Amino acid sequence: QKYGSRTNRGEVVTTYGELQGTTWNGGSGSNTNVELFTSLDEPLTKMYKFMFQKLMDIREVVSIKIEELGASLKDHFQIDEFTSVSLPAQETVTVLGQIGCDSNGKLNSKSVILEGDREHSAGMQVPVDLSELKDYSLFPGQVVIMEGTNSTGRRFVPTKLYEGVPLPFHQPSKEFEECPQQMVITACGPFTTSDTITYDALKDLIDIVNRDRPDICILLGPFLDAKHEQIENLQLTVTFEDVFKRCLKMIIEGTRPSGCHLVIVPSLRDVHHDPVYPQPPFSCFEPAKEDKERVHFVADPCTLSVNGVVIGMTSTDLLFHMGAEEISSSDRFSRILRHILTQRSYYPLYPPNEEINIDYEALYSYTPMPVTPDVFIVPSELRYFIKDVTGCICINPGRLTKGLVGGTYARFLVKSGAMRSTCISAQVVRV
Amino acid sequence: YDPASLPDVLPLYYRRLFPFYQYFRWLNYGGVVKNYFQHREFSFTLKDDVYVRYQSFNNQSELEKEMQKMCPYKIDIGAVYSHRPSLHNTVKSGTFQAQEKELVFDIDMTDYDDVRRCCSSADICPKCWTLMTIAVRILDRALAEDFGFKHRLWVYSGRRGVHCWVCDDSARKLSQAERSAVAEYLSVVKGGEETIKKVQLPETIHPFIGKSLKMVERYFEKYALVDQDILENKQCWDKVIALVPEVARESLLREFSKARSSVERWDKLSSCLEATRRYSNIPKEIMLQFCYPRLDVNVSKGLNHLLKSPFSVHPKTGRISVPIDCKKLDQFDPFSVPTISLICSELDNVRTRDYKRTSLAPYIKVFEQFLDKLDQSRKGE
DNA sequence: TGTCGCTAAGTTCACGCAGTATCCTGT
Numbered sequence: 001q002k003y004g005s006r007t008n009r010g011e012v013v014t015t016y017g018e019l020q021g022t023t024w025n026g027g028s029g030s031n032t033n034v035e036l037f038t039s040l041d042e043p044l045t046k047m048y049k050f051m052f053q054k055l056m057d058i059r060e061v062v063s064i065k066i067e068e069l070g071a072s073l074k075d076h077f078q079i080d081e082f083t084s085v086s087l088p089a090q091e092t093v094t095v096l097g098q099i100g101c102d103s104n105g106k107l108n109s110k111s112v113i114l115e116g117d118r119e120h121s122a123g124m125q126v127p128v129d130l131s132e133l134k135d136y137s138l139f140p141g142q143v144v145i146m147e148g149t150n151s152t153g154r155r156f157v158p159t160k161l162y163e164g165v166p167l168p169f170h171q172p173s174k175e176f177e178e179c180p181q182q183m184v185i186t187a188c189g190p191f192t193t194s195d196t197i198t199y200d201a202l203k204d205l206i207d208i209v210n211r212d213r214p215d216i217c218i219l220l221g222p223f224l225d226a227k228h229e230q231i232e233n234l235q236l237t238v239t240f241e242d243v244f245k246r247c248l249k250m251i252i253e254g255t256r257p258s259g260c261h262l263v264i265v266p267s268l269r270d271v272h273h274d275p276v277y278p279q280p281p282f283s284c285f286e287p288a289k290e291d292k293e294r295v296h297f298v299a300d301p302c303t304l305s306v307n308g309v310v311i312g313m314t315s316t317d318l319l320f321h322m323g324a325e326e327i328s329s330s331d332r333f334s335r336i337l338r339h340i341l342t343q344r345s346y347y348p349l350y351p352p353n354e355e356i357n358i359d360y361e362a363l364y365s366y367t368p369m370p371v372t373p374d375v376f377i378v379p380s381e382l383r384y385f386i387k388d389v390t391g392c393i394c395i396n397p398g399r400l401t402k403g404l405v406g407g408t409y410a411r412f413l414v415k416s417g418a419m420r421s422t423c424i425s426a427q428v429v430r431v
Numbered sequence: 432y433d434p435a436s437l438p439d440v441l442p443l444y445y446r447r448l449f450p451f452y453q454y455f456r457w458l459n460y461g462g463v464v465k466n467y468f469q470h471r472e473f474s475f476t477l478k479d480d481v482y483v484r485y486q487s488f489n490n491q492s493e494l495e496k497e498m499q500k501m502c503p504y505k506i507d508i509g510a511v512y513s514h515r516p517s518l519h520n521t522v523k524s525g526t527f528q529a530q531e532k533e534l535v536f537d538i539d540m541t542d543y544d545d546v547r548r549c550c551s552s553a554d555i556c557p558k559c560w561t562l563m564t565i566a567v568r569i570l571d572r573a574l575a576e577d578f579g580f581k582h583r584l585w586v587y588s589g590r591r592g593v594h595c596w597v598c599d600d601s602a603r604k605l606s607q608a609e610r611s612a613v614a615e616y617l618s619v620v621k622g623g624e625e626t627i628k629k630v631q632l633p634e635t636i637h638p639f640i641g642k643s644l645k646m647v648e649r650y651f652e653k654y655a656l657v658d659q660d661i662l663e664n665k666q667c668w669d670k671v672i673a674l675v676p677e678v679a680r681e682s683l684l685r686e687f688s689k690a691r692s693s694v695e696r697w698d699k700l701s702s703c704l705e706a707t708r709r710y711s712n713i714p715k716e717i718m719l720q721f722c723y724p725r726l727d728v729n730v731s732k733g734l735n736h737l738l739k740s741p742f743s744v745h746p747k748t749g750r751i752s753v754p755i756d757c758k759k760l761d762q763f764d765p766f767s768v769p770t771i772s773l774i775c776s777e778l779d780n781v782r783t784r785d786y787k788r789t790s791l792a793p794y795i796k797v798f799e800q801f802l803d804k805l806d807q808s809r810k811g812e
Numbered sequence: 813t814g815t816c817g818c819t820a821a822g823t824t825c826a827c828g829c830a831g832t833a834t835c836c837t838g839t
């Protein structure tokens with residue numbers, strides 16, 4: 001009722017980049033090449049056996065994460081030697097470690113501990129005293145290098161916190177120099193109103209897709225939300241798989257006129273899918289022979305290449321997860337986004353939030369960020385935004401539905417080699 | 432015959448009588464297999480008992496030469512080896528192996544001493560030779576019927592017995608184990624001088640034993656009951672009594688006190704045994720113990736065994752080891768066998784036909800017929 | 813019928829020495 005009678009349909013709630021006309025048109029995915037970013041590491045494309053984590057394996061994965069990031073930072077900063085975190089230090093020493101909270105609550109400036117890696121510290125921890133640090137921004141699981149002293153052997157006092165070093169951007173090949181600008185419409189779940197299971201917002205978005213004919217449509221989960229009031233109280237008369245199959249059929253068949261490449265990203269809130277992160281792609285739907293080349297069932301997180309433009313995307317609410325734990329000396333979202341980019345992982349928070357199941361071997365294998373993406377799609381319960389963080393266009397399109405009321409989606413234009421202005425324009429628009 | 436005259440006659444014989452052409456035909460086996468004659472082992476025994484082995488020759492000419500040069504007292508034929516025996520020193524250790532040889536049997540009258548009464552040790556007479564006459568028939572029949580060996584050369588050993596050379600290609604490729612199996616199959620009289628009962632047949636008579644007893648029966652009456660007279664007096668028939676269960680022994684003794692002829696005593700023994708049934712084969716066990724051939728399994732088991740060559744000269748009797756015609760076996764007489772002295776007298780009394788003028792000719796003829804059969808088998812095959 | 817020398821690393825085979833395994837003999 002409330003959604004159907006909305007009056008702000010099509011309103012542009014946020015804008016960035018070159019001004020464009022009131023109407024956006026795309027190439028219908030004609031001269032479009034969508035693939036997974038070809039990096040050294042193989043992508044997650046199939047289910048991996050889970051529910052069996054050895055504490056030793058978790059220890060090894062965390063330790064190697066710290067060690068690898070510290071090695072890269074040491075080469076970049078020309079640091080001579082790292083020192084064990086636990087040992088006393090009367091003079092200033094450089095220490096590599098990861099941040100954490102001394103208790104189970106939320107991190108605060110008086111509860112910070114630094115845990116070293118196995119190579120340099122035997123995994124030992126030390127309390128941290130942030131009284132002598134003038135400026136800082138710390139979240140649990142953050143790999144840091146600090147110059148400080150430990151006079152009592154019991155409390156590390158940092159004096160310098162080395163800044164993060166983001167990965168270099170992608171240097172596109174000339175193969176896509178002559179390709180036109182590409183239009184991407186991105187939306188995130190939930191796709192149905194809190195009190196309905198009819199997917200009205202999804203129908204409106206599909207109508208928008210057919211109207212504007214974008215080159216890529218990135219749909220992020222959930223598609224059958226686990227927190228939907230109907231799902232939790234067991235009022236559904238059909239199986240979860242059937243509802244999800246109906247939703248996917250609606251999406252794929254309804255986009256036939258647009259000829260738009262669909263990129264489907266699962267969510268941890270998908271009640272019908274495996275609850276593990278990194279999430280494998282959906283595998284319960286077989287597109288018809290006429291839609292096989294258009295539909296891309298990708299994994300969470302995903303690094304996509306679109307005519308040379310690298311788009312990073314994750315369904316996980318990274319900003320909400322890290323905002324609850326980040327502590328700063330004095331834009332918060334920009335700081336968190338820079339933290340994500342500099343840590344070079346799509347989920348650097350450790351321990352994770354209570355709402356995400358992390359398989360740490362898969363996390364090690366499939367969460368490293370190959371490069372710094374040209375566009376980074378990070379849907380969040382927080383407010384929509386389009387930010388420029390260290391040259392990367394971070395887009396939060398919100399969620400298509402916000403409770404009983406309609407939500408928002410985003411549309412942006414990407415061209416490889418433009419001007420670094422790989423993102424010509426971007427807009428958060430209302431549904 | 433004067434054995435001091437042996438060194439005088441040996442050369443002439445080896446020069447003008449020893450049948451070298453047929454000998455090479457034999458040991459060369461139609462040239463089918465290369466190096467067959469060239470890998471054959473020979474051994475020579477010279478004057479003053481000097482023994483040499485690992486002698487091999489390239490062809491008939493070399494053999495004739497080295498033999499006429501050495502003038503050996505004994506010639507033994509051995510195995511065909513993997514290489515030439517003459518170069519056995521040159522062959523790497525373990526790589527010198529005996530590979531093929533005729534299957535051979537040696538039957539020696541001396542092994543019958545505990546059961547013959549006319550002679551002893553190396554003495555033979557017409558009364559005991561029938562034992563050999565039996566053996567050749569008993570064995571050769573088996574070799575022609577049970578095993579299917581088709582080329583069999585029987586040769587007089589010169590003094591105490593006979594040898595058999597079974598030369599079928601199959602018989603020449605038999606392993607040691609197969610040879611031992613063949614020997615044990617043919618062998619019935621088992622035991623030494625310390626055993627009295629050497630034959631213990633089972634309830635079932637194996638067909639081979641039935642056919643050997645059938646062959647024995649034809650001769651038994653003449654050999655044992657007429658000639659040998661194995662029941663002449665108590666000192667001898669005590670043995671045969673010793674070969675049967677004690678239960679009837681007394682019953683027999685009184686009967687043997689009223690019998691005048693050993694044929695009568697045999698009839699009485701057979702009747703008494705028949706009256707007494709598991710012992711129904713006891714007379715057969717006695718016949719076998721007095722008539723069946725004795726075989727030294729060591730002679731036939733080993734591939735590397737050196738056996739007296741045909742047409743050798745016996746160092747003591749001087750007789751020639753002549754082949755025996757199977758058909759005319761009943762006419763064979765080991766005392767009429769040509770001696771070397773007789774055939775040298777015959778030779779010095781008148782090129783490739785000199786031997787046809789001696790008494791050696793019919794035996795070379797039998798050998799030539801045997802070699803002709805071997806050639807027919809080599810061709811037809 | 814004469815075909816220069818020695819020195820040295822290297823391959824392929826033939827054997828010691830020791831260790832592991834499986835397969836035997838008879839009536």
Ligand SMILES: Nc1nc2c(ncn2[C@H]2C[C@H](O)[C@@H](COP(=O)(O)OP(=O)(O)OP(=O)(O)O)O2)c(=O)[nH]1
Binds near residue numbers: 816817
């Ligand atoms: N018998 C013999 N000896 C040789 C041969 N080649 C080399 N040599 C020996 C004897 C030479 O004096 C010695 C020196 O060898 P070199 O290859 O250094 O050449 P050489 O010193 O004669 O002259 P060079 O180094 O070119 O100024 O090696 C050869 O072919 N036969």
Ligand SMILES: [Zn+2]
Binds near residue numbers: 555556560
């Ligand atoms: Zn006699």
